[PDB]
Amino acid sequence: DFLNPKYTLENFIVGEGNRLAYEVVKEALENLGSLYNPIFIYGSVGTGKTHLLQAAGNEAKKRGYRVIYSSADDFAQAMVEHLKKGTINEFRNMYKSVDLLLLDDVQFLSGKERTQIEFFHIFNTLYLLEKQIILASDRHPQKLDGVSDRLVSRFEGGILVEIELDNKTRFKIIKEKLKEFNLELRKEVIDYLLENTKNVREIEGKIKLIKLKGFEGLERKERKERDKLMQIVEFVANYYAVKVEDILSDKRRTSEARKIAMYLCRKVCSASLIEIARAFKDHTTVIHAIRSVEEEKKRKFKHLVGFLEKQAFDKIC
Amino acid sequence: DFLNPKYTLENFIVGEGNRLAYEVVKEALENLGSLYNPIFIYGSVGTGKTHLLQAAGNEAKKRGYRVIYSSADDFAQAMVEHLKKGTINEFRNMYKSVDLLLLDDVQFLSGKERTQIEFFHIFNTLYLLEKQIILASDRHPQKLDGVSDRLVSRFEGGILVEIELDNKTRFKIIKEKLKEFNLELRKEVIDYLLENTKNVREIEGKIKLIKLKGFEGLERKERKERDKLMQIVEFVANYYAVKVEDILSDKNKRTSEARKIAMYLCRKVCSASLIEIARAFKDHTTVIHAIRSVEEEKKRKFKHLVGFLEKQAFDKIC
Amino acid sequence: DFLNPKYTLENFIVGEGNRLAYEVVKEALENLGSLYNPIFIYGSVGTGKTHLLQAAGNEAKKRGYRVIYSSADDFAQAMVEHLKKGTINEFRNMYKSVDLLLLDDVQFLSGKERTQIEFFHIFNTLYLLEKQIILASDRHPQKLDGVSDRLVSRFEGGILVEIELDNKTRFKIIKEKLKEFNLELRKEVIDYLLENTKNVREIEGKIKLIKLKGFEGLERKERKERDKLMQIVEFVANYYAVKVEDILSDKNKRTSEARKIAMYLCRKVCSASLIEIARAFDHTTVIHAIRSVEEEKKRKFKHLVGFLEKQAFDKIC
Amino acid sequence: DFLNPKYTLENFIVGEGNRLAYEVVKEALENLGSLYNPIFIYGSVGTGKTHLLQAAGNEAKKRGYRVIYSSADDFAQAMVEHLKKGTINEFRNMYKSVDLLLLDDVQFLSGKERTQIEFFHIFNTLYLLEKQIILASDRHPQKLDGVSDRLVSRFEGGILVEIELDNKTRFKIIKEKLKEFNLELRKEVIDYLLENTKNVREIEGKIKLIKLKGFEGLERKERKERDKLMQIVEFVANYYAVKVEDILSDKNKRTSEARKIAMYLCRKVCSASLIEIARAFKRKDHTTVIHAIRSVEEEKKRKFKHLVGFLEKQAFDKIC
Ligand SMILES: Nc1ncnc2c1ncn2[C@@H]1O[C@H](COP(=O)(O)OP(=O)(O)CP(=O)(O)O)[C@@H](O)[C@H]1O
Numbered sequence A: 001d002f003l004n005p006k007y008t009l010e011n012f013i014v015g016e017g018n019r020l021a022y023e024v025v026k027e028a029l030e031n032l033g034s035l036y037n038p039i040f041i042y043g044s045v046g047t048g049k050t051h052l053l054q055a056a057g058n059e060a061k062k063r064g065y066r067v068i069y070s071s072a073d074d075f076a077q078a079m080v081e082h083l084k085k086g087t088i089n090e091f092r093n094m095y096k097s098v099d100l101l102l103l104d105d106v107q108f109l110s111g112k113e114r115t116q117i118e119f120f121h122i123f124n125t126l127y128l129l130e131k132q133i134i135l136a137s138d139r140h141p142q143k144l145d146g147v148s149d150r151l152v153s154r155f156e157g158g159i160l161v162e163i164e165l166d167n168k169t170r171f172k173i174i175k176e177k178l179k180e181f182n183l184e185l186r187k188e189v190i191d192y193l194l195e196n197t198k199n200v201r202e203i204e205g206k207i208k209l210i211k212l213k214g215f216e217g218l219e220r221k222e223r224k225e226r227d228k229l230m231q232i233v234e235f236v237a238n239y240y241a242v243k244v245e246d247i248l249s250d251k252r253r254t255s256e257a258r259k260i261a262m263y264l265c266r267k268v269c270s271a272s273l274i275e276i277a278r279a280f281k282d283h284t285t286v287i288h289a290i291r292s293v294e295e296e297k298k299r300k301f302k303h304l305v306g307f308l309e310k311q312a313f314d315k316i317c
Numbered sequence B: 001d002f003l004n005p006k007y008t009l010e011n012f013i014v015g016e017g018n019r020l021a022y023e024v025v026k027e028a029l030e031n032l033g034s035l036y037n038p039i040f041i042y043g044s045v046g047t048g049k050t051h052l053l054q055a056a057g058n059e060a061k062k063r064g065y066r067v068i069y070s071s072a073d074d075f076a077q078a079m080v081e082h083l084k085k086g087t088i089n090e091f092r093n094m095y096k097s098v099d100l101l102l103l104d105d106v107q108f109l110s111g112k113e114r115t116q117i118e119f120f121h122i123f124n125t126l127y128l129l130e131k132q133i134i135l136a137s138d139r140h141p142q143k144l145d146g147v148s149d150r151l152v153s154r155f156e157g158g159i160l161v162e163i164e165l166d167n168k169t170r171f172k173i174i175k176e177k178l179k180e181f182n183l184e185l186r187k188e189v190i191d192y193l194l195e196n197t198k199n200v201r202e203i204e205g206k207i208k209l210i211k212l213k214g215f216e217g218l219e220r221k222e223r224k225e226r227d228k229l230m231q232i233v234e235f236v237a238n239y240y241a242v243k244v245e246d247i248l249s250d251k252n253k254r255t256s257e258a259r260k261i262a263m264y265l266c267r268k269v270c271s272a273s274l275i276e277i278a279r280a281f282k283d284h285t286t287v288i289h290a291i292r293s294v295e296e297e298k299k300r301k302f303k304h305l306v307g308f309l310e311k312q313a314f315d316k317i318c
Numbered sequence C: 001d002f003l004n005p006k007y008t009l010e011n012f013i014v015g016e017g018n019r020l021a022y023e024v025v026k027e028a029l030e031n032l033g034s035l036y037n038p039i040f041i042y043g044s045v046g047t048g049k050t051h052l053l054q055a056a057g058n059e060a061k062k063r064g065y066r067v068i069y070s071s072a073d074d075f076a077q078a079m080v081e082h083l084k085k086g087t088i089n090e091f092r093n094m095y096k097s098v099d100l101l102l103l104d105d106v107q108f109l110s111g112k113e114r115t116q117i118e119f120f121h122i123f124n125t126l127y128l129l130e131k132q133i134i135l136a137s138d139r140h141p142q143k144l145d146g147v148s149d150r151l152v153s154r155f156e157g158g159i160l161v162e163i164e165l166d167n168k169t170r171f172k173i174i175k176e177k178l179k180e181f182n183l184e185l186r187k188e189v190i191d192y193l194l195e196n197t198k199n200v201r202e203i204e205g206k207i208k209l210i211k212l213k214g215f216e217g218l219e220r221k222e223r224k225e226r227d228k229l230m231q232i233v234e235f236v237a238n239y240y241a242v243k244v245e246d247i248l249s250d251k252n253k254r255t256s257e258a259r260k261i262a263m264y265l266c267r268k269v270c271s272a273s274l275i276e277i278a279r280a281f282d283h284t285t286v287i288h289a290i291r292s293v294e295e296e297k298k299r300k301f302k303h304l305v306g307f308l309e310k311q312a313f314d315k316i317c
Numbered sequence D: 001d002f003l004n005p006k007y008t009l010e011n012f013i014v015g016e017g018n019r020l021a022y023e024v025v026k027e028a029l030e031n032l033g034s035l036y037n038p039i040f041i042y043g044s045v046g047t048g049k050t051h052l053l054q055a056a057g058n059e060a061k062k063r064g065y066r067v068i069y070s071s072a073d074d075f076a077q078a079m080v081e082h083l084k085k086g087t088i089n090e091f092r093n094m095y096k097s098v099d100l101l102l103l104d105d106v107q108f109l110s111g112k113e114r115t116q117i118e119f120f121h122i123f124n125t126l127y128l129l130e131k132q133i134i135l136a137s138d139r140h141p142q143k144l145d146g147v148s149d150r151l152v153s154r155f156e157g158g159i160l161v162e163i164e165l166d167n168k169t170r171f172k173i174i175k176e177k178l179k180e181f182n183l184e185l186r187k188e189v190i191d192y193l194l195e196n197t198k199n200v201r202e203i204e205g206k207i208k209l210i211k212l213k214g215f216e217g218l219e220r221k222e223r224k225e226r227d228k229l230m231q232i233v234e235f236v237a238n239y240y241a242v243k244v245e246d247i248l249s250d251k252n253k254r255t256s257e258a259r260k261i262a263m264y265l266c267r268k269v270c271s272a273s274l275i276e277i278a279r280a281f282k283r284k285d286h287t288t289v290i291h292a293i294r295s296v297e298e299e300k301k302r303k304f305k306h307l308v309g310f311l312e313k314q315a316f317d318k319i320c
């Protein structure tokens, strides 16, 4: 065993944002490997990829099939010990004799050459034998730099499903979770969890705190420090005429105010990148958006920043 | 076995790009090894080489004949275990006891010297007994570095067939793979699968996805994150007035200096993949030292410009 | 058994590069084993040495004379087989019972002792009994290292016949191979095959191609991927202005140093294979010559090579 | 039989290198097992040992004696198969009955105890029944490791003859082989075979090649390759001043250090074979050349390295 039984088909919630992946996994777990076999699942972190996979193999062991789950960076670490302890073949045949192959976090294949090569062989091998293979990554095939070309066209030749947690999809997931716990559904809670959670981990992370220290316990820790970061409705809106709602959406000098707001949050307010990125969720934007500020600290600028730096101190310190 | 019944001759589609390798493998499967034996197939990625090989040996055992399929690298790992298990003879005998040999992905012989030689013998053995042998690689025999001189000069000397899927070639593969479901007819679908797919894997990779999401699903997704790379209609065309389609550049240092440029941006600002980027050049290698040469020439009267573009992209794209 | 009927004496072709070997085996096949016994035939890969041995043994078994064909590595494996099974006795006796022994590809004796000591006797026996003994190799006897001096003495004792097909020799093979396939002899047909083939395998295979995909339907692609290798008339010829055909030759510092660079370009730029380079010319040469380009990489000359690399990506890519 | 008639005592060429042997055998054939019997001939490979035995046997099977010729390895082979078939008795008596025993290439008795004790018997028997016995060998009796200290005495106890082929001895041979064919004598030719052949097999290896592809055919093949091997007169001579002929002659450490290099360059640069290297100047065996260039990188473990890398650079530019 390396599958946890607490993940299952029913158990997983379905909305138009992970419906297709759900049904590919379910619709295929019937004729195992003989329906449509190379299934690649990909989605943002905490999109439920791991669930979906753990949940497939669980159904297989229950139905009696011979099954392996493994993260790609643990497949590597095994192959690397078996290689050392001169047992690379009982390793291979272990994998070649699965009714279902569940390879998780495929993205960790980059750079590992022989460590890839190895999988390529069990792949074709299980494929040719019409066994069932389910891959899963954080990124689409195309984006796998540092993974051999012959594997990527391999991945694309099957079924690519994306898991894109939209809004209506988060609607359902929050709603169903609150029901799961036996908390009561109410617009206030559902709407907060809507405008404050992007992945399922975040949701359920928060739905447990709700199950633990009420809801009026959330909006203090969660919102208060990020009300100190209402520095947008604060100052940069009032300086060079900016409307809050437009600055919270990347959209052409209207968008030179942003680069300042994020900066003031870092240096004066001491907030973390992640803390700051939750005013915009791609955490590199902030970093070079804050550097370009002093990358352009070279004509009638230096004193403008300082005047505002002194302005936030008075207000907040 | 290792032969999947799936692939078969009928089940494989024909146009003037793989017609040759078909009517070679077809006639050759009648008097096996007697008409013409050492057939050597090579194409690009997912060209249909494995289909063909699989299809033949399936027709073969379908007639009684003894048939083996293997990748070159599984063959490796078969020889070297037999070796450790000291049964290297029943290994040899097994291969010399066939009417047809299907050696797929031959290219994986590079480097292996013991791993090759062993095949050399079963090759020669099979040949002189006039038994049928078909090879397959991603490359032409003479592009097979790391392979004995004596095997290459054996590969060249049977029959060399390439499979070049071009225009009027794939068209058929597209228009035929649709009746596989029920999408046989609409111009919009086909014209998308025409200017978006090179190999057959992509051609069925889309179709199945399309027969699921529905075509319009893949016109937003495959048209949105490829529209951040609509950074071609965006700005690269507007500084040094280079025409757009000229940037899919079949040969002037204008649409070449701007060719090398556009790719640099997609890589740094849009954080795109070498493959995403390499689908601008409607090949991975190209992009690399074209993305390096830009900063290989960073240190001349060339710098701040880029910095000014980077700002534009960071504003017009971020 | 191992004698394939398709190889015969009028099924072979005769020129001033193989005729001697041909008549050696033609003359010495009539008075068998008596005329001249140790026949050592040798030449580069694809020289027709396998044909000859095969074509000989055929005529002999036509005339009833007890023949054995075999590769030397076929003999090796066969020995150990009989050996391990405990029946080496009937092995020797079989081999000593022939009127004509044909040992093909002798080079594969190197390193093998009992695997080779056993041939010794066979040889010696057959020989004393004036029974025909024809050996084949890719190299000259004295080039056969790891092989007993006693066996080499045995080899050099009989007749050595080299086969080299230079310029005049090949025309006759092409001419007759073109007639063999029911193809029309034409100057463009014949002339291409001249400057584009070496071994007779190469000859028969372009012909096989042109019997199927036209002729110019392949003077296109063939001369096209060797057109991208026209990298010599392209640039290096016009720098240290040394002309084209002079570079395709080994002799100081203006052509021997312009040749190295040209090789470098087809490897680093046009990403061509070591074999493909060598047709602008054995593998050995290219490898340590392009290594010596970066063996003398040790300062501002790097800046000069870096320029032509830039010239290459511009003009070709 | 195993006696190829092609071998006759007239048929064999005599020079005071293969004289004594030839004499003792002819001398001891007119009265077998009577004059000096246990004849142990030995000498370099391709000396004519086999010839002499074949010839000797042939005569004794012309005078109506009972003769057996066998190689020492083939004697073992037979002894074993009989030992299996349970026929060692008729096998023994077969060998004990010969008027004349010919045992060629005795070198292959080594390491075969039970496969050799048998012979020591046939020997004693035939010897006491005063019957003729001739052994041939690669090495002198005293040189034979892995042979019974009892058989070696026996060997040494009869007659030892060596066959060293000198130069005058070779002269006569070349002369008469040319004569044997329809070839004409002339200086360049007969003188070519001299500094180009050592064992008699080489002599008639050329002559069969000459009576086939002229003489202006080997001048290139057999001498052009070994003009590139004139690397001892192109570089190793033109560095640390050690002149051509001084390298070939087995003698300061100035010369001994030139060879190790000279030989190296042929191997790794021109890819010459270990045989080719030795056949070019100093020829004892293989051992010499090979483990000496090995002593090159065994003495490569630091300022030795750079001087060689500069030489390789020279031999690549000049030849490649
Ligand atoms: N659609 C869904 N329905 C029910 N539960 C879900 C769900 N998606 C995720 N979960 C739950 O959230 C937790 C984390 O999800 P999971 O680990 O599957 O996502 P993931 O594997 O994509 C994150 P990573 O990016 O680290 O792989 C699990 O305990 C799982 O039960």
Ligand SMILES: Nc1ncnc2c1ncn2[C@@H]1O[C@H](COP(=O)(O)OP(=O)(O)CP(=O)(O)O)[C@@H](O)[C@H]1O
Pocket (backbone or CB within 6 Å): A150, B007, B011, B012, B013, B014, B018, B043, B044, B045, B046, B047, B048, B049, B050, B051, B052, B105, B173, B200, B201
């Ligand atoms: N002409 C044709 N007709 C029908 N199907 C085809 C086809 N050519 C290719 N295919 C399909 O493409 C898929 C993969 O192709 P295949 O494996 O034969 O090419 P290939 O061997 O070049 C892949 P790789 O480059 O990884 O070896 C198969 O599922 C097969 O059905």
Ligand SMILES: Nc1ncnc2c1ncn2[C@@H]1O[C@H](COP(=O)(O)OP(=O)(O)CP(=O)(O)O)[C@@H](O)[C@H]1O
Pocket (backbone or CB within 6 Å): B150, C011, C012, C013, C014, C018, C043, C044, C045, C046, C047, C048, C049, C050, C051, C052, C105, C138, C173, C200, C201, C204
């Ligand atoms: N002079 C000639 N006449 C007719 N056919 C010839 C020929 N020389 C070569 N061939 C053809 O070339 C093919 C291969 O020749 P062969 O196998 O004898 O060369 P070879 O033995 O040198 C290859 P290797 O060196 O790998 O053993 C044969 O099919 C034979 O028909």
Ligand SMILES: Nc1ncnc2c1ncn2[C@@H]1O[C@H](COP(=O)(O)OP(=O)(O)CP(=O)(O)O)[C@@H](O)[C@H]1O
Pocket (backbone or CB within 6 Å): C150, C153, D011, D012, D013, D014, D018, D044, D045, D046, D047, D048, D049, D050, D051, D052, D105, D173, D200, D201
């Ligand atoms: N003195 C001589 N006169 C005439 N011919 C001679 C000769 N010595 C050798 N030969 C010839 O040279 C060939 C080789 O000589 P032979 O085989 O007798 O020497 P050998 O017994 O030393 C071979 P090995 O040492 O390898 O067993 C024979 O075919 C024989 O015709």
Ligand SMILES: [Mg+2]
Pocket (backbone or CB within 6 Å): A049, A050, A104, A105
């Ligand atoms: Mg996961």
Ligand SMILES: [Mg+2]
Pocket (backbone or CB within 6 Å): B049, B050, B104, B105
């Ligand atoms: Mg394949």
Ligand SMILES: [Mg+2]
Pocket (backbone or CB within 6 Å): C049, C050, C104, C105
């Ligand atoms: Mg051969």
Ligand SMILES: [Mg+2]
Pocket (backbone or CB within 6 Å): D049, D050, D104, D105
């Ligand atoms: Mg002898």
